[PDB]
């Protein structure tokens, strides 16, 4: 008919004849095509899908059911392809499955559907619902998996991976992550993992970390990655600061003589997700007092207005032992070197001696005692190997290991589920704060609101960081009934008012 | 009758119908008098009630004050105000709802305004996000009140903003200055909207506390702030080696 109209009629009526033919050939038979649409999508016949897409572009209202069928099929395919996975490669396999589904339904949406943008939005919405598949009465398992995938990729692993391979796989990760709708939890998980990798030196290359921070920056703006960028920059300028400190101690009039190789890794405490969890006081050992005092002097005379907090929660130092014929050197946590300098006074010690020498609390002391006891670097002389009120134990002369640099530090990664739920609780607390703020700013703007209108407005405004489910908004509203400005109206139960 | 009220304030509960029946029996007796139908109620169960509940809450506040700190005090007091509102509608006439609560406030938060305002500075400095909310409510319905917290928080944001400007590094002072103010403004517009709420007395207490920060010059000097915002505004527009796109600039 296109040939016929172009060979007889005037050119100005090409559109009207073709549209009218489609207004009777396809639009009148819309019900039959829409009935077979779901079956055609489910079998995924590419030629029939293309022909159906053309014939429903012809009809004014035939397209949206095709869109809905494609979205439902893609959501079903993704949810079947990602739910059942092994528990040892779940972080890699989840992103791999979501990326595979996305690649298949970008190819099959760009080669037989002309890359129609409504269908791409349907794909985006379907995989958005796929990735955040919350188990009923359970928290979402997406952002933990994505953060663990990035920590697995970026850390210096013994599997061996090409740097450019890491680059393109992280680009694919960004394509997966662009729809996760829980970016706050992912942000803080990745902040903690980035902190651990940066501090412990487990990053494979700082350039890869910079690339990852940049990719998240184009993914979610600059305020999403401001803290991460500050972390990376304050880890990168650590070398310059340490060289400046060495130039300072060179320029001192008297001989400084620290005696210890010193690199300090100062971190911006206003942006690093580290915490001063060991609030119990710790005592710096004797020979390290000169180093701490000299670094404070450097940081106060060459630089101004900032107070250090020697957190000691994750410090390391290489103690050399020279009683068994100088056998080995052990890199330990600073509490472990504290108890080792306690051992330096005499072979046998006591519990109260350990508190009057190191001032630490009982939990960290128990942890270090267990760490040294499992290594058997220091044997325990009492009957029971647990925490003891006296804790009378001497040096272990039976230590006959083989590695010249064996450590009593195995907390390189850890990340216990207690820590994961603690970070989840902290993110939920910040979500409560932000959600209360959004609720009350909307209310103060309106001063009278229906309940559902307030829910919709809050979900719309707080969309910039996540999509809070109605449970959180109801919890925040019930909190704001007690605290501060909101009250149930007397006219109805869904007429919240500003007080 | 007042002993039944005091028994209710002690923790137990008398007959809800009988107590309200006889208090509402001081109205409904003078119902037919045209001028001042509540005149009998205003002189037999208003002055003997407000004086008694004023006396009862004059010493109950002193019991709680001397038995707990300021943090627990505002939990009990705001608990009592919520509780006394229920015990006012359960028994009394609806025309005396405001007077009992106002009498409860004026002897539980207005008699101890000297104590509360001495703890106003310590709560904001530690940035407690809970007691600072409870202090706002107890200092909301009382006129002598909140303008001390207005000046206290204005003396705290400016104190936090000052530490975001002084001792700031010259290496990247354009970006680091504007971010630090935005970090201070960003945190303290959410905290003033959640622990406190949107209150033009308090929102202006941020601006007055921040205009003394984005204009803070050391004595006898040119104000460094306008060029610090000018240099920063140039770096975003000027072609930088970082190569940030238009999306991260706009």
């Amino acid at each position: 008919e296109e040939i016929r109209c172009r060979k007889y009629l005037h050119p100005s009526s090409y559109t009207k004849v073709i549209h009218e033919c489609q207004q009777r050939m396809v639009a009148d038979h819309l019900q039959f095509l829409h009935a077979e649409c779901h079956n055609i999508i489910r079998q995924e016949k590419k030629n029939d899908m293309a022909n159906m897409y053309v014939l429903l572009r012809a009809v004014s209202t035939g397209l949206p059911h095709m869109i809905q069928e494609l979205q439902n099929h893609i959501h079903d395919e993704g949810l079947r392809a990602t739910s059942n996975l092994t528990q040892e490669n779940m972080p890699t396999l989840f992103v791999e499955s979501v990326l595979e589904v996305h690649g298949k339904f970008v190819q099959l949406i760009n080669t037989v559907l002309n890359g129609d943008q409504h269908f791409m939005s349907a794909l985006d919405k379907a995989l958005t619902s796929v990735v955040n598949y919350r188990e009923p009465k359970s928290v979402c398992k997406a952002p933990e998996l994505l953060a663990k995938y990035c920590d697995n990729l970026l850390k210096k692993s013994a599997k061996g991976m090409t740097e450019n391979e890491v680059e393109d796989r992280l680009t694919s990760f960004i394509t997966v992550f662009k729809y996760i709708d829980d970016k706050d939890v992912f942000q803080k998980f990745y902040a903690r993992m980035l902190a651990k990798r940066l501090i412990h030196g487990l990053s494979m290359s700082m350039d890869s970390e910079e690339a990852m921070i940049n990719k998240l920056k184009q993914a979610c703006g600059y305020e999403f990655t401001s803290k991460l960028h500050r972390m990376y920059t304050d880890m990168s300028v650590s070398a310059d600061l340490n060289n400046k400190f060495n130039n300072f101690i060179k320029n001192q009039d008297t001989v400084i003589d620290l005696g210890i190789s010193f690199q300090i890794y100062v971190l911006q405490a206003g942006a690093w997700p580290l915490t001063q969890a060991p609030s119990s006081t710790f005592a710096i050992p004797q020979e390290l007092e000169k180093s701490v005092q000299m670094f404070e002097l450097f940081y106060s005379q060459h630089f101004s207005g900032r107070k250090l907090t020697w957190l000691h929660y994750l410090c390391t130092g290489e103690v050399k032992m020279n009683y068994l014929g100088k056998p080995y050197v052990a890199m330990v946590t600073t509490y472990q070197m504290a108890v080792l300098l306690a051992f330096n006074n005499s072979e046998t010690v006591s519990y109260k001696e350990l508190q009057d020498s190191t001032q630490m609390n009982e939990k960290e002391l128990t942890k270090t005692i267990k760490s040294l006891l499992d290594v058997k670097m220091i044997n325990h002389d009492s009957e029971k190997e647990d925490i003891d009120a006296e804790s009378s134990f001497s040096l272990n002369m039976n230590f006959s290991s083989k590695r010249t640099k064996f450590k009593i530090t195995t907390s390189m990664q850890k990340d216990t589920p207690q820590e994961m739920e603690q970070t989840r609780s902290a993110v939920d607390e910040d979500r409560k704060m932000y959600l209360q703020a959004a609720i009350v700013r909307i209310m103060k703007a309106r001063k009278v609101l229906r309940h559902n209108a307030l829910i919709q407005e809050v979900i719309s405004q707080s969309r910039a960081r996540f999509n809070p489910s109605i449970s959180m908004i109801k919890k925040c509203i019930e909190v704001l009934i007690d605290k501060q400005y909101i009250e149930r109206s007397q006219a109805s139960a869904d007429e919240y008012s500003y007080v | 009758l007042l002993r039944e009220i005091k028994n209710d304030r002690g923790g137990e509960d008398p007959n809800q119908k009988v107590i309200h029946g006889v208090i509402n029996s001081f109205v409904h007796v003078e119902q037919y008098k045209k001028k001042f139908p509540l005149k009998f109620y205003q002189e037999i169960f208003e002055s003997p009630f407000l004086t008694e509940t004023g006396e009862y809450y004059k010493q109950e506040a002193s019991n709680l004050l001397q038995e707990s700190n300021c943090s627990q005090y505002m939990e009990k007091v705001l608990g009592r105000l919520k509780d006394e509102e229920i015990r006012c509608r359960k028994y009394l006439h609806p025309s005396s709802y405001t007077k009992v609560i106002h009498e409860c406030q004026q002897r539980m938060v207005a008699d101890h305004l000297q104590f509360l305002h001495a703890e106003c500075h310590n709560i904001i400095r530690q940035e407690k996000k809970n007691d600072m909310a409870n202090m706002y409510v107890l200092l909301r319905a009382v006129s002598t009140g909140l303008p001390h917290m207005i000046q206290e928080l204005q003396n705290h944001i400016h104190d936090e903003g000052l530490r975001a400007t002084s001792n700031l590094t010259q290496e990247n002072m354009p970006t680091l200055f504007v971010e630090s103010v935005l970090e201070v403004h960003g945190k303290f517009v959410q905290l003033i909207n959640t622990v406190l709420n949107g209150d033009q007395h308090f929102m202006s207490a941020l601006d007055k506390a921040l205009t003394s920060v984005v204009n803070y010059r050391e004595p006898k000097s040119v104000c460094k702030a306008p060029e610090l915002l000018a240099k920063y505004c140039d770096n975003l527009l000027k072609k930088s080696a970082k190569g940030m796109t238009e999306n991260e600039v706009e």
Binding site: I199, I260, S261, F262, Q263, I264, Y265, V266, L267, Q268, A269, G270, W272, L274, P285, E287, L288, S291, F295, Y299, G305, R306, K307, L308, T309, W310, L311, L314, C315, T316, G317, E318, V319, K320, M321, N322, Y323, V329, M331, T334, M337, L340, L341, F343, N344 | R163, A164, N167
Partner: peptide
């Protein structure tokens, strides 16, 4: 006898109280 070397200490800085 115990002696230490290579202290890879970590510290946090924050704006001073004043």
């Amino acid at each position: 006898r115990f002696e230490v070397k290579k202290w890879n200490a970590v510290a946090l800085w924050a704006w001073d109280i004043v």
